Design a protein around this ligand. Sequence first.
Ligand code: MG
Ligand code: ZN
Lengths: 197, 148, 41, 145, 302, 225, 79, 79, 100
Amino acid sequence: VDYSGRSVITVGPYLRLHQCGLPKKMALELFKPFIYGKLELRGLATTIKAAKKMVEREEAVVWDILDEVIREHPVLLNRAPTLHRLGIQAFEPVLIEGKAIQLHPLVCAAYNADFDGDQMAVHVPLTLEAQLEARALMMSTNNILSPANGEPIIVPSQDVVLGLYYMTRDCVNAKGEGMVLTGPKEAERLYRSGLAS
Amino acid sequence: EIKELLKLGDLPTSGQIRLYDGRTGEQFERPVTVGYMYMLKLNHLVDDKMHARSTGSYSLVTQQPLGGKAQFGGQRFGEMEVWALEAYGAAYTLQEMLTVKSDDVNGRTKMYKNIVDGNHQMEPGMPESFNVLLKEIRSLGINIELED
Amino acid sequence: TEAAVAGKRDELRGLKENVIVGRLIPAGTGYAYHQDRMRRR
Amino acid sequence: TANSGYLTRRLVDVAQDLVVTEDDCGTHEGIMMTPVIEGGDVKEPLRDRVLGRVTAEDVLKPGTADILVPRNTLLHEQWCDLLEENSVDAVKVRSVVSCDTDFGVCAHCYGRDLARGHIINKGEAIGVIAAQSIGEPGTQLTMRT
Amino acid sequence: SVTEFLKPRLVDIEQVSSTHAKVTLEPLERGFGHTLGNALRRILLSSMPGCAVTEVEIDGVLHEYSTKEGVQEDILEILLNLKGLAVRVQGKDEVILTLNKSGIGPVTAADITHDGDVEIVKPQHVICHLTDENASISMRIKVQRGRGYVPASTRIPIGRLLVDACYSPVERIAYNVEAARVEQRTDLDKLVIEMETNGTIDPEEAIRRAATILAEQLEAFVDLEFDPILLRPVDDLELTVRSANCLKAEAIHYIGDLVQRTEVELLKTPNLGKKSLTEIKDVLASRGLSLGMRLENWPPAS
Amino acid sequence: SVTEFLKPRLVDIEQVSSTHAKVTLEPLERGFGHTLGNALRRILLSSMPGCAVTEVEIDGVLHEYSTKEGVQEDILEILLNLKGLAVRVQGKDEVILTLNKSGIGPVTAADITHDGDVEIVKPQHVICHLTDENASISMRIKVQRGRGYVPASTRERPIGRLLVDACYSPVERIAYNVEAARVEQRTDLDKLVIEMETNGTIDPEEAIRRAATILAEQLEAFVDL
Amino acid sequence: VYQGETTQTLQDYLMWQVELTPFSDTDRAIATSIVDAVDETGYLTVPLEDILESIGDEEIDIDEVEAVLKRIQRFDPVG
Amino acid sequence: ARVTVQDAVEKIGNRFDLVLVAARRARQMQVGGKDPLVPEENDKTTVIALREIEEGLINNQILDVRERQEQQEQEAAEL
Amino acid sequence: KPLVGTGMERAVAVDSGVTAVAKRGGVVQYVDASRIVIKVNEDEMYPGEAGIDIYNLTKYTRSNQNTCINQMPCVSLGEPVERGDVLADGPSTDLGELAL
Ligand SMILES: [Mg+2]
Ligand SMILES: [Zn+2]
C-alpha cells in the first residue's frame, strides 16, 4: 500500500499514552498531498508545481505547514508478526528529530516488542471515516482490556515496578523516623531537603 | 585476583563507587557498579532502515506498489493485518487499504485530487488484481463472470 | 473444478469474499451498509 | 513458529464468517457449567466459568423452589457473588453452539465482549477474535515431545 | 555572537488559586532549564525567610504525651494544627501570643488575642474542638523569624512543647523541562514550575524573591504572506474597457479577489458576457492563474 | 539579621599546572555551596567559548581519504591530530596560520609560522612525521572562535579544502567540593573549592566570571516576571 | 515472475498537472484533447481547429481553446 | 484535543454508529458550509464533531430533521 | 585493543590475511603510509640478488559489505624486524591484535 513507511523503534519515556514519536523526515513524505493542499490553500503557492518545488527545497514554512496538518491526525503503528488485533494501534504523532520511531513503554507488552533492533511500520489514514475509526476504535487509550480473557494489558514492568517498590518500603532506623507530618506535601518537602529518609 | 589488582590500583574492592546526578548534583542513594566494557557497533544502521513513501511506481501486471527500499516501495499489508483490522470492525480503513492505496487506478487519482482539494472522501472502485484473476481463470477454459 | 462442473453461484456473504472484491465487510462499521443493501434488494 | 502460524491460519479460515447478527434467538437450550475438578484438586472454580454469561434457566435455591436468578440474566460480579453465597455448583447457561440464529449468533448466546464491560454489540466479527485469541498463545506451547 | 544567549519570550502564568500558580518560560538554551529549576527549587526550599511557631506552653499539660480533659483532639493533634498556622510579623523577630477560650465549639485562629504586629492570614484555621461546656483551653505560643525548615528533633523548662519550625512560605514546588523549537534550533528547553505557598506571599513574589537572592549572591563575580502576484491591482492586467468596467462595478480591485471568483458567479454578472469572461480567463492563464482558487483569509489587513 | 546573607568572594587561585587550577569562593551560607557549584559546573561545561580549527588546505591532497608521499600518517589522521590543536587568538575571531616543513623528523605545532595575535600553548603537539629527506609539507590552517560542538556536516568549496568538526569548549572537566569555612566568629559558613581542568587556552578567573555573568543574565528574567 | 514497472512520460506528467488544476468539465476535456496531441519534444502537432472538431460540441469557440492552451503552456516544463 | 471518546460512545450508545454519525457531521462541516455548534479551539472537523456529539447537540435524528428542514426550505424558496 | 581479552587475538589477526607480515628479517629501509621497504639481512639473501622486500599497502578499498579496507604501518624507520613480525595493521587490528 501507499502512504506507508517503516523504521527502527526507540523508547520515549516522556510520551503520553495516546502519543507516538514520528521522525519529521518520514512525516514530510507521508503527508505530502496534505502539505500541497495546505500550501495552495493559504496563497503560499499558486500552482501545484510551485508547492512541489517548495516541498523539494524544504523551505522553512513547510515545517509549520506540516506541524499544522499533523495536529490531530492519527497514524497506525504495526509490528510483525501480527498475532492479535493489538499488533496494530493508533497514535497521535509528535514530530521529532532523527530517524527512529519513539514508542510508549506501557504499550510494549501488547506489541511484544523490545528495543534491541525491532522495526515497526506506520500507515496514514486518508478519509474522515478512517480517521474516526482510528480515533474511536484503534486508539491505544481504547485498548486497556485483553479481548481474549479480559485482563489488563497496560501492566507496568521492570523500571517502574522497581522504583515504586523501592520508594514504598520501610527501614527500621532511618533518618527522620518518629516525627509527625501535616501531609504528603510536607513529606516531599522533607525528602527533597535531605532532612528525612 | 581481580580484587588484588584493584587494590594495586588504589580502587575499591567491591568495584562500586558513589555517583552524582549531573542535572541536580545530588548523590545517588546506593553505590553503582562503574567500570570499562568492550562495546561493538553492529552492521544495523538506522540510515539503511528508515524508509517512507506517499506515491511512486507500480507493477505493470498487478498495478500494485513495488517492494523494497531500492525502489520507492510501500509496506505490505498482509493477511494477519487484515485479520487485525477485521477484529476491530474498521471497515473503511480496510477498504481504503484494499482499493485506493494499492491497485485501483482511478481511485488513486481521485483520492489524490480530493486530498489536494481538502476533501477527505474516496470512491472505492474495483481492484485490478481481481480482473487479472478473472482473465487468468477464463484462460483455463472456465466461464467465470459477474452478474447483476 | 468442482464448482465449474456444478455451476455454483457465490452470493458474497462472508468477510473474505468482500475483501477479495474490495467491498465493505459485513461487520463493524460496514454492517449498516450491508443491512441497507439487503433491505433495498 | 510455523506450526503455530498454520494452526492460527486454519482457525481464522474456519470461522471468518461468524458475525453477531441478532439480539436474541429465544432458545431455551444451553450447557451445564460446573467447576473443573481433577482427582482431589479444583483447577477451575465456577465463578470464572459463568462470569459474563446469560442464564438459560431460572436458578433456584438448593433447598427450596425459589427463583434466585431469573432467566435471561447477564451474570456480572454481583450475580456471581450471590451464586457463591448460596453454594451453587451447576448453572445452565446459553452458548453459541446451542443457538437457533441462522447465519450467525445472537448477543445473548455470546455474552460479555471481554474487551468492554457491556454485552456484545451487533456486527462484531467474533470468529476472527476467537481465532486470534486461541492462536496467539500458540508460541508458548511445546512442539517437541 | 559568542556571548549572547536566548531569553524567554512567552512567560505564561496560570493562577489555579490564590496560593497555587503555574509558570511557563520558553525558549531556553539546552540544559539551562534544569539549572534554573534546580537552583530556584533549592533556594525556595532551604533558604527562604519567614515567621513560624517555635514552641508552646499549655497550663494543664506538662508532657507531650498527655491527655487534656475536654479536648476532642490529642496534644500532638494540637501541635500539628499549630504547625500549619501562618502568621505575618512586621515589628519584631520574636512575639508571644495567648489563647484563652471557654465554651463549646471549634477553637480557631480567630480566637487568638489581637496584636498590632501579629497578623493571622487565616482566622478560620481550626486549632481544636472544645466539647464540654465546663471546659477551657489556655496556652501560650511563641513565634520567631528564621529561614527554611528546622525539625524539633535537632533541638532536643517544664511544659515546653517543641514544634517543627517552617519559616519558608513555600509549601510545594516542582519543575519540569520539555522540548521547544525555534524555526531553526530544536534542542531547546521549556521550563514549567508549579508552586503552592501558605498564603503569606504570592507565588510570583516568592519566585521573584528567590531570583533576587540568587542574583545578589553573584554580585562579586558578575561583570557588566500571500504570493506577490495576488497583491497586484486588477489594473495590472491589460483588460478591455468593458471588462475593466464590469470588474470595477463588481467591487474587484486586486488579483486575489478575481481569482477567488468562480466562473458561474461571473457569468450571472450583468454586462459581462461570455466573450469578456473568456478574455479574463485568457489573461489569467497568461500568468499561470485560474478562477477556482480558494484562500482561508484573503485580506491581509492591507 | 536573618534576611541578610554573607556573600562569597574569590579568595585563592592555585595553578597546579598550566591546564589545572583551583578556585576558592568564601564564605557561603548553608546550602548555597552545592547550589552555586552545580550551576557553575553545568555552565562551565556547556557555555565556554574558545578557538578551534575548522578548515585545512594541503597542496598535494584532494580529499581526506588519500596519502601523501613521504608522510607516515594518512590525511585523516593528520586532520584528527589538528582537531586537538590548542590556539589562543587574542585580536580577531578568525585567523589563518601557515605551516611549512621539510626534512626527516616530526612536524609539531612549533613549526607553525609565528603570528602576533596567535599564541600556541602546547608547542610539543605532534602533527605528523616526515620519513623522506626530500619530502616537504605546506598547509594553511583556518582557526575561528565559537562555543560548543559543531560537526562539519551541519555547516561551493573548491576541491582540496578539508572540513573538520569544531569543539570550541576549552574546559575538559570540572569538580567542586564544599568544606567548613573558618570565619571570625561563626561556624555555620562553608567554602567552595572548584577544581578546573582545561586545555590551557582560558584563564580560570575569567571563566568563573563569565559563568557568573551568564547565570545572572539568564536569572534576571525571573526577577521581573 | 517478471512484471515490470510503470514509467512516467511527458503526457503522464501533463495529465497529472491537469487533474490538479481548477478546470471545468469542458475545460478539462479541452485540456485532455490538447495534451493528447503533444509529441515527445513538447510541441503541438495539430492545429487548434482539429482540437475544436475533436471536442464535438458546437457551443465552444476558438477563444476557449486558446485560453486553455495558454493555461497549459505554463505547466512544467515551461514552453 | 481528544484523548478518549467514552462520553460520545455513552451518548450514542454504539461505537460503530458513533463513527458514522461523526463522519457525517464532519463532512457537513468540512465540504459543506455548516458552522460548528461548539466554540472550536484550533480543532479539526472530526474532533469538533465528537465534541458536539458529547454535548448532546448532534445525533442521527437531529441530523435527519435538519436535512428535512433544509430540503423543505430550499424547495419552498425555489419558486 | 579490547583491554580485557583471552589471548587468541594475535592468532586471529595474524592467521587472517588482513595484516602485512614480514617474509624475511631485516631493517626497515623505507616507511610510508602506502609502502614499506625492508632491507633483508645478508644471511637470508639469495645469491645474485639485491635483498629488499617491498610491501604495497591496501588503502581505502571497498569490501563485499561496502565497508572500508585500509592498512596502516606500525613500524618506524630503521627499526629491526624479524620473520613473522607484523608490519602493517589491517581493519580492526591494533599492533597485531584483533580490535573489534
Ligand atoms: Mg527484539
Ligand atoms: Zn442465540
